[model samples]
Target: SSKFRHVFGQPAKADQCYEDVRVSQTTWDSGFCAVNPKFMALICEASGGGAFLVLPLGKTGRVDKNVPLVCGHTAPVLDIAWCPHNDNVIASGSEDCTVMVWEIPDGGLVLPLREPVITLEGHTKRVGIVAWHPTAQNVLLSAGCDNVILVWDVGTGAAVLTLGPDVHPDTIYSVDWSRDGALICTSCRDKRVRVIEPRKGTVVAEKDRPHEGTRPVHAVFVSEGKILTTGFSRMSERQVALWDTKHLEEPLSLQELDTSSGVLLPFFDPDTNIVYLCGKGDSSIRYFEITSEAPFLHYLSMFSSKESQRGMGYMPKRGLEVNKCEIARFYKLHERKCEPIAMTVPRKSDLFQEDLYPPTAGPDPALTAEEWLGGRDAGPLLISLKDGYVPPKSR
Candidate 1:
């Protein structure tokens, strides 16, 4: 179970564990949740986006009824997304077939947030997910049960490009932005995987037969032009694959797990070259290290929980506390609770070590959202935010 310790000569240090921060009850099939660019507040959906509850990161008791909620949608809200470039702005989509953007003032929401800075209306059925460009500014993507994905210029609330009048013949399952925000990978109910360069409205590479299975798949880009996906086999076994996007002829490696109903959500850390898999309605989170050699994904230990998660949110790497050797933090969700847990390395040395963990986080999106939507490449901007790898808490 000490696999990571074997690799790093130390285990992660965590002084605290997940603590239940009570929340308003939510309905099933709900997927709305987000932590802002900073680790200060949490935005979670209540009554399926009937309203959004924003609370402090430290509060863990009954949600204060007086704590205001964001309400603008006439129908259930299906998803919420935090703008990667701003700490106060957020986007939400609803069954009402509209996406509303709201800006929270500096002091936090002391009263209700009723009017949206802008409202984006263009989906057919209920909207499912909204993801921001990891590096770009003012760009947002949303998908709906209508079987279409839309790229938006949120600055003017205009539709940048709408894909899937034909690409995905069935319901779109998942849409993931690449590490640099240039490419998007989507998995569909048709059991196909398509890569999109959203700005140009084109498919770079698509493997209609990415899996020999009938179930929906979830895919995320990793390394250089490669992907990791998870789905169910025709025999009902849970499976995962690593693909070379150069051509989807076949996966570099494949593995199977026991049958389950929950869909596997994959999270990849480029700095550590590690991937973490979490299943919907499942209680465990398993992690793996990706390598260049055969059996590309090396198995790491698993983090298990006594309760299943109805939904989940992962914090950005910049928000982590490197002074304490913290690597990541996950905001786990339950029927009526949200909990925060940290991942860190416990080194034996008293001084801050530089070479142990180098920088991996990059700078802002080189192109503004407008440039990206027009097929222009801002090119990738890679910059480290830290001065150097040193401990803020020296022994």
Candidate 2:
């Protein structure tokens, strides 16, 4: 550990970063043979009504049908997430009204993963989304059609806190932990966006009718202590906006688009201050650079594909190929094939310098399980581990 600290700089916070991935290279034999992708990237994609598939990206890629099937949920798998604390550990939510946590082996598992390390059954309806704390380990946030959100300890398989004792009026659309892991945000069927305290299990702030349209609305934390959201307009046209969490009576910007079919999934890169909006049924991912100025989100570029995605997954900053100046990697899932998309900067030289790395990047939070349950909103500071970089911005 000490050797790497002096060599690779060990930790990075983002200094020079660009926002951007492809799923078209795999033709088999000639491919991945020498690519050695077993340790590259792994994506867990859910099935509509069966076991979710854990597709490892070889140099860049499922369950059952000869793949290692993670069988447990009798119903369709709804959501799954990789743990930032442990690459091999994963959490999956299902229509069976349960959440299962599985520990994958070092490279990949060859046998059927029929049993889970821990199974959490508390929600009455099907589970929708499961998110891990950006800074905390074993701490997770899960929501469901039952209108409940549970903060559980994967270590003990216990529900530490449950939000919405009043029970949301309808389904919980999505839930996201703030960059620091102190607050959580959720968009709901009740037509509201709420900022919550996970430990206290209370709503800290909320905005109703965040999107006037009837479809699901998605909201996430951004760089300027603001929230970014994607949903639809009154006419059902897709739209995205940024909101000041304190007073969301009106969004800072409500940019509308033409598409209306798929749900827009917003992926924000805190380091680069960029956000990528990927539509569930759309083949293109639109990215924008967010700033402190007006038109807060600046359009960058789009990563398009010939195949529309059934689902998608993104790798963590720590797992990226820094040697190639790779910024981000996306696991784009088509019908049955999982594609690897690499986003990078156009490098000028083949040599690497210690200054190019992000100073804000490092391992998980240093807090123990006992320290996290205190209901303290110490904030995302604990989450951003990099010191030299991202110090002011990460705060």
Candidate 3:
């Protein structure tokens, strides 16, 4: 009877120790880290302005008031990665169009990185993502809106190689390196994915027009052997497909679902072989198990919240509004249940607004609505605003 009580807590005993666990806290806009199992090291993105945060996995997630990594880059940080060879070494990329390398501490507060050991500055556009070479310690890669990819030698803090606009004119959305560090893969708005050899800057393989061109191509390498991509068909139906590095003809298997109300933002977990898909239209995180078998997906449980189902969308008056209207949709091809969630950045204007209204017969509407109405006529309006407008100086 005592043994049973130890294995399964007594019903009455469960409530005895119901204290809430509070992890560490950080300032608003502080980027987060997803550390490996050891708790010895971590990878963190920028938070606030130029500062980044790194906490050992075993330590609480809260920021130590005195212990933070304040590095270079005057703007907000976008992405970060830890060196595979040395956990103490990390790389970060930011909207400032620069990438920097830092050396962190094992236990105490990481001193203010006086200057980045290396500063990678070549992209003319904002740097959106940065990743480390899978096997090599000093090697890193960054992608940006300029549709260019830069390979850096962290030891030298220099750009070793630059790749692309070679195949596509569109912005390069994401980039990644293969497990062996022998190949590089990139996705772009051209609706194409290309795998390149960093040393030669040559195209090793290419997947053309993978998606029909409705959604921006967002791709990433999951495990060592496969590549995962998300896009939409002409009808705006969200789709996910997997490809083998060995073959480039067509997807090994493709899955399509109605993501009409929201766009899918998928993140892969190597430890569990699962892909978590979230969207701006839903507040829940949906899970799909990836397998080696045919079709390769098993829809598991979903983590839902009342707040999650309300889709987030651009709002003119409030700047951005969350759409709470309930819309039931299903993945027709797979018979899988498709629920929307809030996995996307809030669609809002940076400027303040006095009033909000859904465009119907309004005299002036937001660029998005005007584009939807005028179609080809909206091209000039979009182009004229390209460099972005500022208020005129008083005469």
Candidate 4:
């Protein structure tokens, strides 16, 4: 019997929902929401300035329309990411061609946060994506419309490395760091999926035209040595495929999914060996199990809702309520509010599900920015969820 076949999604009660908030209207295909254990951040529509709202996770319900926001960017905030090593820190990439890192005050912000701890200025064009290194402290990567990728060292506020001007011929649609933080995989408008070693600025492996469609392609690293990508087929049908890095000449498995124009957002959970696909503007979240066996991608159930989603924020494994059999949670952004959906397994016992959640990547990073940039590679530190997650004291 499949252990996860009975997993069901439960939307939070209305009292726990954040309502009356103006979500961003940007046409860019980036997740307008980011959440950590302590707080949830949302990119909101600002009248003339670029701003995003930050709220403590516990303070959810009827947000005030005029609540003070983090408004420092001169243009629209395209993407936001909470620092993996420190929950109090968050970064924003804006159309103003700058990346700003803000340190949230303890217990959340009470007034408008205008000044950032540091601003990373390197990209000439509007930055569309901002991501932190999975297992490195104070390391960030931002991709811009200028066809450049600038990796920043937040500790010193410097662009340590730059890539993609000579590597990618067009705008990069998506970028993902491998589990070990050793490599990165990116899909581009040029119709290629590349596995790059960032420090060396080398493309270790690449596949041309992973998908035939002209729409944006999103690629992410899956289990060891494998990649999962979502794009449109030549017939305009949406598709997802899996490829082994060793042999990218062809996909190990290819499935032509439904016809939807919204770019599919992929969230991979290494512990469960499950990959979830959430297409922008789509009402359903489809999941599949990946294994080394034949037909590597196993179709799982889909969680569908009446309303479509504008963006999604995935919680880290440590944020789950393990004692309640909650394996995953998603913060789904709607037209005017943000809702929390908990994915729970129907288990009779209250004990922790060992098989469902292995030792997952914890908040503590394994390396510093200097160590990572010095050509050393290390996987994320692992922590057991047996005791349930407890928020660390504020610094």
Worst 10 residues of 2 by lDDT: 27-36
Give me the overall lDDT of model 2.
0.65
Model 1 residue 86 CA deviation in Å: 0.7
After superposing candidate 3, which stretches have Cα over 4 Å from the reference? 1-49, 58-69, 110-112, 222-225, 244-250, 258-265, 269-273, 279-282, 306-395
Candidate 1 lDDT tens digits, 174-222 = 8898877778998887777889887666888887766676776888888
For model 4, residues 300-341, the per-residue Cα lDDT tens digits are 788989989998999887677887888889999999989999
Question: What is the C-alpha local distance difference test score of each model?
Answer: 0.70, 0.65, 0.51, 0.89
The whole-model C-alpha lDDT of candidate 3 against the native structure comes to: 0.51
Q: Candidates sorted by TM-score, descending order?
A: 4, 1, 2, 3
Q: Which stretches of candidate 4 lie over 4 Å from their true place?
A: 388-395
Give model 3's TM-score versus the native structure. 0.61
Number of the top-ranking candidate, with TM-score as the measure = 4
Best by lDDT: 4
Question: In candidate 2, how many Å is residue 352 off?
Answer: 4.2
Alpha-carbon deviation at 175 in model 2, angstroms: 0.4
Total colliding residue pairs, candidate 1: 2
Model 3 over residues 282-317: C-alpha lDDT tens digits? Answer: 555565656787676656556555543212111111
